[PDB]
Amino acid sequence: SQVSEHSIIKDFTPEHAIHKVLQLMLRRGEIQHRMQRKVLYRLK
Amino acid sequence: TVRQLESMIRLSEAMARMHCCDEVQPKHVKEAFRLLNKSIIRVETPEYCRISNLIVLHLRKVEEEKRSELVNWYLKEIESEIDSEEELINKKRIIEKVIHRLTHYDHVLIELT
Fold this sequence. Notes:
The structure is cut from a larger assembly and holds chains A (44 residues) and B (113 residues).
Chain A (H helix, E strand, L loop, with lengths): L1 H11 L2 H14 L5 H7 L4
Chain B lengths: L1 H17 L7 H14 L10 H14 L4 H10 L9 H14 L13
């Protein structure tokens, strides 16, 4: 979940950047990154 | 395509014109269709029934809109009609093929049947 994307923010110890990098990865390709969003997003 | 339809019309007209007819009867159309269909060749690739499996199961996964439950839900859903203890290994083998040639991430987004 995106809350997990924030948990990985906390344990590493910014929202805009963490969302932007994943957003770029989303158009980068198919494997391991489309598959986490292609179903979570549709199921919200 | 539709060009095949116009080819069929031309061929039926020629078939009629061969018999010196003033109008095309359905026997001419039947011969034109038979010739046109016979000319077109099936493309043979080396078993090829597996595409039947892929289409029938991709359709179900489409209808439903993890691996653990879903894999054996597949390995029951297509077994609902014909008895065999021997086509299960076949279905799991083709499922592995499909996994490892990147047609299943459990039904990848970009794949048209």
